[PDB]
C-alpha cells in the first residue's frame, strides 16, 4: 500500500507511481530516514 504521498488523492484515484516522498523536513534528492519509498508492504502470514 502507499504510505507516503505529497498530497491526498482524490476519490477513486489510482497512484501507481513510485515518487519518493520528502516526509522528513530535510529535502532529499535517499532511503532509511527523512524520505522513503512511497509504497509499503504487508506482512500477511497465517500466524498473524
Amino acid at each position: 500500500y502507499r504510505l507516503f504521498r505529497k498530497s491526498n488523492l482524490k476519490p477513486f484515484e489510482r497512484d501507481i507511481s513510485t515518487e519518493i516522498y520528502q516526509a522528513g523536513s530535510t529535502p532529499c534528492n535517499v532511503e532509511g530516514f527523512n524520505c522513503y519509498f512511497p509504497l509499503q508492504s504487508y506482512g500477511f502470514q497465517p500466524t498473524n
Binding site: 482524490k10 477513486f12 484515484e13 489510482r14
Partner: protein, 37 residues
Amino acid sequence: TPINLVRDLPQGFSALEPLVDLPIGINITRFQTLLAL
C-alpha cells in the same frame, strides 16, 4: 452543423449530443490534437 458560411463563425445555435463515458479518470490534462501531414 451546416457550416459553410463565408468567413469566421456565424450567429446560430445548436447543441452537442453525448456518445460515451469511459472510466479513465486518472487526473487528465494536456489534451493534444493529432495533426496529419
